[PDB]
């Protein structure tokens, strides 16, 4: 307790002296006050030279001790004195030095209390100090770092001082990059983070990463550290105004492409949505690190990585940029752009086909509706690809034969089966065009799109075949160019595919259903970039509703399509937009609340707003119910805040489905469909269990439409023991019949819920994070808010790619392959500042690979700690890939 | 007060707290940095009139009287001073002079039908009303 | 701090507020419902309802009449017993009607609106059963002879009933598990029911004897029943030891309750009517007690021996409880298995737990070969007096 203390020359005494302000110093309060003014200078400062060596001392003294609840208010009451007159009143040199334990005094205040309000409040006092130090803070740091007397306290504390420099309310380049950021960042994965997000201290960092890298190989986990700043800013939406906080992702996705690590770099990247950013990724990694390492490698790979929707590579609105980035960055032209290119990822899918088999039972039962039903049923068991190749191959028994909208459905459908193939899914095509009907012929040029996707860099695309085929006159052959135009690109800001859409889409009501598909196609293309507009869609979807609203599948599509081709920013928007304005509808009103999200080049603030003055749970008859229900699933805002964040967002979405329910006896029915798309989209944390859940409920209940929904999702794990979960499920699906109608829908899902042995369940988000964003599931769902299906219905649902590419293991440096690699078990969780969470391996032994299946495998890792490496690509193969970052041009790896 | 009057005020006031109270407690502003506050109630009520008392009177009783000594004058045809019986001190007060009207029988003064001679003075005019022959 | 502070007091006020909320959209008393299935649900109910089966007071056929009033006439005698003479609906359709099971009639006017389930007379024993749970082979030890003798019989011919019937065999009904205890005859049990994806049902041998006599006779009937009924039935009787025991009377309380359910379980299986859609599968320490119509075929018809393993058998023991454990594979699988032979699967598992005791004790993380050779030589010598084996192996 002792009264004053550092005011005694021994160490000991110094450790009372931290207590002694609660009753008051002898003469230390007054040395630094009263007596500093009243009393001339030069006299003080004999009485205080001898209190600044303890003053010193005692700072890592203090630290050495452990209260914090009696070390906390005692200190900060002597704090005031210091302030009044010795912070650069005293003298010109003596206050530099005297500041540097009174940063001490404030710090144990700033560490313990761990809210944002006191975050803030600390940072405004500790700035000014920061700016009169003029440096004494980094000398501060380092010494903590050593431990003179120190053992514990000084961890969490130091990295606060670091806190301080956010305000800059003196600070201009003082303090603002490098101050020791790097041994700060490598200890604690916590504080620094938010720290470095709102800094934009970010940046400095690039420039020490190769030296940050040696850290981060396995002396110490700083690769948890660079994980956790890009969990900060996704959170940090809500947190302050998206307006505000767009400058803030963009400056974070500078710093992470360039930094090597780039799977953080592709989650905010693909938030915006934007032209110029997918290029960078690419270059930058590059130019920083003077070493080739896993950088060059990098900017490949993030294309891969990262998971959107449909065609392989994803958004390929980078893979089409790609193409003269690709020369720049060279490990080898040849090599670079062969594995880059489709064939690649293409090739090791053909070999995987193989192993995996057929696991259901197929049908082609000849002649009838049950022709048109089987045709269906053949995608739907992959739920993707798989060894359907064989069956599919005899044009004759299925296609010629199919009657109706079934030719052209089945016709439809073909295409995304025969994904995953470079040719030999195309010579199918190209015979079925010759054929027989109108309708087979209209369906296969929407396939041909599809098929040539797999090769592409300018290698045999998709756009020249297609071109040609816009022409026609047909609206089904029309908007099968134009659908597959959208499918096939997925993103697009070249000029020929842009003014292919100009003047066709001049369509706004038609007898078929799926011309309404046209519109979601125009603004397939808008995804992933800035504006360039295609004036016909936007001019076409006002007039649509008011037209026609009473066919609900048509009606969903087309002022969906006119909020996601106005996403992303420009001035070409701007001339249309005032053509769109004079027109004013209360039709056209909540389409104008999805533009105002697209317009800012995605939010998430302005978005949450929204949804709560909301269209949700709204109609008159039909007119303001066109976007309730996709509003009110709020899936896009559950994923684009942490994975954290995500787990909670999730179990409100559910809750909120069922409040729609209650609201609308008409909203109860589509509230269960809902339920399937919705878990879909999301990419839960409630995941295995509830689906099937409400399933078996399902049976009993009338309306055989909610299995054949629910049975996408459900189909989940695909076998390795999950297969006794799938026969029991496939049983009931079997067992009932009752009506064909009835047996349709019920066929479907039978031979959806079968998968066949190591194949994989659907994935949106990109395998290391629950942010994604698909524009493919939303035709699927839309078509599916019907009572029963019809053969035309079926088409649209026979969909449901967006799926893995069959490489989950060893992306490698110089493997590429379908080939396993070593993994070790461990059933701990220990992290929470990992992108999802991967843990330190023990290195146990157990079989080959992490699981090739769209879910787990999580906890299962990589070892690369008899590599003595890091990875960079966190282990999961919900879509990951474990690959490692060494100064080597090359993995050493070992292989098993 | 007439039912269907009082009906369109009650309805008004409803309207406006429940839909001020909706958009008002949904918003998000807390968390954000413009903190107006996530949750903010909204409701307006509504007051009636009570009985009104324009200058002092003495109630005394159920009130077969009721006074002040401040006066007031009031015209014949227009009782909108609705006495109570047995007041012969209130009408025509303590007896008028100031009136065309000049007592000559002396505060006989019955709450009824009070006209004495109108031909002593004259401080103002007298319209005859052919009205009560009409009804009859 | 003052932003949580503020965060905090107000939430917990909003749920005060929000209360009449709370009891409806949530549930906990009035209204339970989310209403997308209970929409559905109570739709349904309500029909029903309206007319004559709510109150709908339980009450069972005790015999088909054709006296007083209509043809179709029966005598009902409620749960209060009082009997009653009662007509038929049409007005909602009959479905599971038999004599002396239970049916649902009236309060208001008594007449069968609908019967209750087929034999739902024991509710007891019908909620204690798992359905089909997933056991990995992770921790259903070894990989042995001994596990795969057990599959042919239970899960081919349920799994496919198409080869039995082609040659014109009859299909496999029984098997006895017999040998004394910790070689999982329960663990694998479960393991195979699940593999083969038939229904699920097991059942404690304590359970099917309760107080009275004849109580016993009422739940092995109903359930045996009850099992015929449904699409294909596995009834695993669980661990009869004494609550199995061959017939004898002491004059006192007698083995009466026990040989109760025993013999109720011959009545139905040999009757005269033949077991139904039923398969039994026995699980005895002690076949020394069982009584001689249980032992021979027709409920038993292959014996198999779930004993104490074979020396090559510990070795896989091993091998597949590593797999679930996180321990060192520079640990040798073999040696183990030769340093404590005669040693039931239960004893391998005690030996990876005590290597993980020294292990926690000492502050690792992961258990070494140091605290497993150690954990195997305490397992011969000590626990080998306790053991079950020297006993029930007699009996087996």
């Known amino acids: 307790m002792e009264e004053g203390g550092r005011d005694k020359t021994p160490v000991q005494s110094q450790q009372p002296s931290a207590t002694a302000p609660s009753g008051a110093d002898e003469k230390s309060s007054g040395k630094e006050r009263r007596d500093a003014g009243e009393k ?29 609840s009696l070390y906390r208010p005692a200190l900060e009451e002597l704090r005031r004195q210091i302030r009044s007159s010795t912070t650069s009143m005293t003298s010109v040199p003596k206050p530099l030095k005297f500041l540097r334990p009174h940063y001490g005094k404030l710090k144990e205040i700033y560490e313990n209390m761990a809210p944002g309000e006191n975050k803030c409040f600390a940072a405004d006092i500790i700035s000014v100090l920061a700016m009169t130090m003029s440096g004494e803070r980094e000398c501060l740091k380092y010494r903590l770092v050593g431990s003179q007397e120190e053992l514990a306290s000084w961890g969490h504390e130091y990295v606060r001082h670091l806190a301080g420099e956010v305000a800059k309310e003196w600070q201009e380049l003082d303090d603002a990059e490098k101050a020791q950021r790097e041994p700060l960042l490598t200890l604690v994965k916590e504080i620094v983070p938010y720290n470095m997000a709102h800094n934009a201290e970010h940046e400095a960092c690039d420039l020490l990463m190769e030296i940050e890298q040696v850290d981060m190989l396995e002396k110490d986990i700083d690769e948890n550290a660079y994980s956790k700043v890009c969990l900060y800013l996704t959170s940090c939406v809500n947190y302050v105004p998206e307006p505000e906080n767009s400058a803030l992702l963009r400056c974070a996705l500078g710093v992470f492409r360039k930094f090597s690590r780039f799977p953080e770099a592709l989650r905010l990247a693909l938030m915006l949505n934007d032209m110029e950013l997918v290029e960078d990724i690419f270059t930058s990694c590059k130019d920083v690190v003077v070493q080739k390492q896993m950088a060059f490698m990098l900017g490949r790979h993030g ?71 089987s045709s269906f049923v053949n995608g739907f068991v992959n739920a993707a690809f798989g060894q359907d190749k064989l069956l599919t191959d005899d044009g004759n028994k299925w296609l010629y034969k199919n009657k109706d909208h079934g030719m052209l459905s089945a016709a439809a459908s073909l295409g995304m089966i025969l994904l995953w193939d470079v040719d030999g899914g195309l010579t199918q095509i190209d015979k079925y065009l010759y054929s027989s009907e109108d309708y087979i012929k209209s369906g296969a040029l929407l396939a041909c799109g599809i098929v040539n996707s797999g090769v592409r860099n300018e290698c045999d695309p998709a756009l020249a075949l297609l071109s040609d085929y816009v022409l026609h006159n047909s609206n089904t052959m029309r908007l099968g160019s134009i659908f597959g135009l959208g499918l096939a690109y997925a993103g697009s800001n070249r000029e020929d595919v842009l003014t292919l859409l100009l003047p066709v889409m001049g369509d706004s009501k038609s007898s078929m259903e799926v011309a309404g598909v046209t519109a979601l196609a125009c603004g397939m293309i808008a995804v992933g970039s800035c504006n360039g507009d295609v004036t016909s869609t936007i001019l076409q979807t006002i007039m649509e509703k008011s037209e026609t609203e009473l066919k609900d599948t048509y009606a969903r599509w087309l002022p969906l399509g006119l909020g996601l081709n106005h996403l992303g920013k420009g001035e070409a928007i701007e001339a249309i937009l005032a053509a769109l304005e004079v027109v004013s509808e209360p039709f056209r009103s909540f389409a104008n609340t999805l533009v105002d999200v697209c317009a800012y080049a995605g939010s998430g603030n302005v978005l949450k707003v929204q949804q709560l003055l909301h269209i949700c749970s709204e109609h008159f008859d039909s007119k303001e119910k066109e976007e309730d229900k996709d509003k009110k699933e709020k899936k896009d805002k559950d994923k684009k805040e942490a994975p954290a964040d995500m787990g909670a967002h999730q179990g409100v979405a559910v809750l909120g489905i069922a409040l729609i329910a209650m609201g609308e006896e008409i909203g109860a029915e589509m509230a269960l469909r809902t339920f399937g798309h919705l878990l879909r989209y999301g990419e839960p944390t409630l995941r295995r269990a509830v689906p099937l859940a409400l399933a078996l409920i399902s049976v009993s209940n009338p309306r055989l439409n909610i299995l054949d929904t629910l049975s996408k ?7 390795e023991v999950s297969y006794n979960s799938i026969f029991a499920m496939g049983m009931v699906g079997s067992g009932t019949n009752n009506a064909r109608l009835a047996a349709m829908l019920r066929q479907l899902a039978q031979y959806h819920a079968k998968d066949p042995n190591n194949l994989f369940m659907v994935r949106l988000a990109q395998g290391l994070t629950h942010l994604g964003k698909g524009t493919l599931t939303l035709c699927p769902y839309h078509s ?50 990992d992108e999802e969470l991967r843990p330190l391996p023990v290195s146990v032994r157990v079989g080959q690979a992490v699981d090739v299946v769209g879910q787990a495998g999580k906890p299962k890792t990589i070892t690369g700690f008899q590599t003595h490496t890091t990875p960079v690509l966190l282990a999961h193969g919900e879509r990951a890939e474990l690959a490692t970052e060494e100064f080597l041009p090359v993995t050493p790896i070992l292989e098993g | 007060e007439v039912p269907k009057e009082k009906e369109k005020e009650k309805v008004s006031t409803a309207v406006l707290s429940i839909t001020a109270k909706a958009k008002k407690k949904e918003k998000e502003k807390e968390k954000k940095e ?32 009721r006074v002040m000594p401040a006066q007031l004058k009031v015209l014949s045809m227009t009782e909108t001073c609705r006495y109570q019986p047995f007041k012969p001190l209130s009408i025509g007060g303590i007896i008028i002079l100031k009136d065309t009207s000049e007592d000559i029988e002396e505060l006989v003064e019955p709450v009824a039908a009070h006209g004495p001679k109108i031909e002593e003075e004259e401080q103002e005019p007298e319209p005859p009303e052919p009205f009560e022959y009409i009804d009859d | 701090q003052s932003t949580y502070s503020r965060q905090i007091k107000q939430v917990e006020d909003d749920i005060q507020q929000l209360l009449k909320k709370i009891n409806e959209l949530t549930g906990i008393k009035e209204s339970d419902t989310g209403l997308a299935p209970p929409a559905l649900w109570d739709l349904a109910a309500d029909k029903q309802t309206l007319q004559s089966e709510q109150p709908l007071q339980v009450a069972r056929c005790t015999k088909i009449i054709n006296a007083d009033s209509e043809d179709p006439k029966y005598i009902i005698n409620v749960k209060q017993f009082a009997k009653f003479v009662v007509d038929l609906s049409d007005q909602v359709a009959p479905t599971d009607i038999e004599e002396g099971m239970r049916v649902g009639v009236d309060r208001n006017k008594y007449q069968i609106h609908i019967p209750l389930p087929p034999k739902i007379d024991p509710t007891v024993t019908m909620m204690q059963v798992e359905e089909k749970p997933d056991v990995t082979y992770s921790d259903v030890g070894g990989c042995k002879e001994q596990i795969e003798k057990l599959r042919e019989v239970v899960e081919t011919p349920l799994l496919h009933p198409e080869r039995f019937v082609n040659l014109g065999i009859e299909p496999p009904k029984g098997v006895l598990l017999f040998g004394p205890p910790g070689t999982g005859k329960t663990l694998c049990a479960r393991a195979v029911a699940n593999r083969t994806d038939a229904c699920f049902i097991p059942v404690i041998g304590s359970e099917l004897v309760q107080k009275y006599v004849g109580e016993g006779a009422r739940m092995v009937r109903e359930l045996f029943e009850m099992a015929r009924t449904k699409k294909a039935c596995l009834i695993f009787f669980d661990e009869i030891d004494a609550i199995g025991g061959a017939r004898f009377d002491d004059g006192a309380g007698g083995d009466n309750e026990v040989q109760r359910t025993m013999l109720e379980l011959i009545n139905q299986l040999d009757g005269f009517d033949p077991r139904g859609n039923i398969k039994v599968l026995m699980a005895t320490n002690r076949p020394d007690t069982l009584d001689p119509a249980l032992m021979r075929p027709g409920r038993l018809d292959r014996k198999i021996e779930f004993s104490l393993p074979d020396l090559e058998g510990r070795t896989h023991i091993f091998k597949i409880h590593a797999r679930s454990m996180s321990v060192e594979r520079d640990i040798r699988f073999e040696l183990l298995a030769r340093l404590c032979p005669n040693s039931t699967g239960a004893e391998i598992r005690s030996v990876c737990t005590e290597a993980g005791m020294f292990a926690i004790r000492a502050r690792r993380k992961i258990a070494t070969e140091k605290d497993f050779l150690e954990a195997v030589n305490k397992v011969i010598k000590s626990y080998a007096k306790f053991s079950a084996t020297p006993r029930y192996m007699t009996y087996n």
Do not use: C, W
């Open chain 1, 40 to 68: 001339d200078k030069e006299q003080e400062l004999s009485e205080e030279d001898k209190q600044l060596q303890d003053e010193l001392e005692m700072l890592v003294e203090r630290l050495g001790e452990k209260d914090t």
């Open chain 1, 303 to 373: 294309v891969f990585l990262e998971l959107s929707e449909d065609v392989e590579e994803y958004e390929d609105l980078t893979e089409i940029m790609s193409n003269v980035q690709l020369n720049s960055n060279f490990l080898a032209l040849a090599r670079e752009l062969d594995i880059m290119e489709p064939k690649v990822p293409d090739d090791i899918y053909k070999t995987h086909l193989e192993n995996n088999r057929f696991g259901g039972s197929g049908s082609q039962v000849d002649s009838a509706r049950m022709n048109l039903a």
């Open chain 1, 713 to 719: 999702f459900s189909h989940d794990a695909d076998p």
């Open chain 1, 784 to 833: 599916d808010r019907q009572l029963m299906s019809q053969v035309a219905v079926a088409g649209l649902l026979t969909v449901l790619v967006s799926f893995l590419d069959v490489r989950n293991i060893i992306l490698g440096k110089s493997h590429y392959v379908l080939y396993g690699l070593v993994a070790a078990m461990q059933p701990r969780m220990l992290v929470t500042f």
């Open chain 2, 34 to 65: 413009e903190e107006k506050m996530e949750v903010d109630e909204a409701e307006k009520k509504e007051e009636k009139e009570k009985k009104k008392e324009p200058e002092p009177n003495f109630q005394l009783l159920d009130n077969p009287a």
